[PDB]
Amino acid sequence: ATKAVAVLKGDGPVQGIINFEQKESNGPVKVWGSIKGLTEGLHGFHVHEFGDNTAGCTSAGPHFNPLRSVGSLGNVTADKDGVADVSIEDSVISLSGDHSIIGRTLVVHEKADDLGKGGNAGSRLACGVIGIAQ
Amino acid sequence: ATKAVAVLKGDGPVQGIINFEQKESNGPVKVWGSIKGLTEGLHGFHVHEFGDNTAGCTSAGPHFNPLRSVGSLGNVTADKDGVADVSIEDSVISLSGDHSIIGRTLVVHEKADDLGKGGNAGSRLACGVIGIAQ
Ligand SMILES: [Cu+2]
Ligand SMILES: [Cu+2]
């Protein structure tokens, strides 16, 4: 596909809408949107393997790792008002092929992803299946 | 993918969980599950174009159809207690390729689909994005 969207919903104040767009088949995917209701600071932002909402965020499974994982988008950053303004360009994920995240689940975490440099990401606050958008 | 699921939800009492499984990459897709809260009788059952939940079932767009539409899955049948136990096999939709319904929306309608043989489907009661399942 060319465009997609994930509506992030959970049991709490955290919610948001994240859009995805990829023009070239093997080109980067632009990810942008906003999430609010967050504790100030960094929050793990990943694509988890299953777009299964039968138990909400709980049935999403582990990170998408077709074989950091392909689903690891890093962190989003919430300001003191609890809002994270998202704008990313990623060339590992795709909206088509073996790396397609279409039909999988976008998750924002309670904690930061230390990305392997914690010098020594918690629960899934809000999640959404990634669907093909207009 | 080889398996998928959609959780149907809407404004009213109609709820359901529908599973999909496709053994061979180009083979038929088996659809099964249950839906409750429906009026006895036939109810249009289709895959709509977009897996966009930003505006309920309204943002799902039209019937999925790459060239009955590809997206039409016929009707489901609610029994006298409003339960539609679903069991369908379809060789036109797929879980990969140009006819993939992954990332799109499954919708159960208020009225029957006449399938072009009405002798001369209404509102969207519930819907859910179709996601990859384990
Ligand atoms: Cu995660
Ligand atoms: Cu329809």
Curated annotation (Swiss-Prot), chains A, B:
Keyword Transmembrane part of the UniProt annotation: no
Record annotation: effect of changing residue 82 to R: In ALS1; 30% of wild-type activity
Entry EC number(s): 1.15.1.1
Cofactor(s), names only, from the UniProt record: Cu cation; Zn(2+)
N6-acetyllysine: modified positions: 111
Effect after changing residue 111 to E: Mimicks constitutive succinylation state; decreased activity
Cell compartments where the protein resides: Cytoplasm; Nucleus
Disulphides: 57-127
Main location: cytoplasm
Keywords associated with the record: Acetylation, Amyotrophic lateral sclerosis, Antioxidant, Copper, Cytoplasm, Disease variant, Disulfide bond, Lipoprotein, Metal-binding, Neurodegeneration, Nucleus, Oxidoreductase, Palmitate, Phosphoprotein, Ubl conjugation, Zinc
Sequence positions bearing N-acetylalanine: 1
Extra facts: The protein (both wild-type and ALS1 variants) has a tendency to form fibrillar aggregates in the absence of the intramolecular disulfide bond or of bound zinc ions. These aggregates may have cytotoxic effects. Zinc binding promotes dimerization and stabilizes the native form.
Subunit details: Homodimer; non-disulfide-linked. Homodimerization may take place via the ditryptophan cross-link at Trp-32. Heterodimer with SOD1. The heterodimer CCS:SOD1 interacts with SLC31A1; this heterotrimer is Cu(1+)-mediated and its maintenance is regulated through SOD1 activation. Interacts with DAOA; the interaction is direct.
Designated name of the protein: Superoxide dismutase [Cu-Zn]
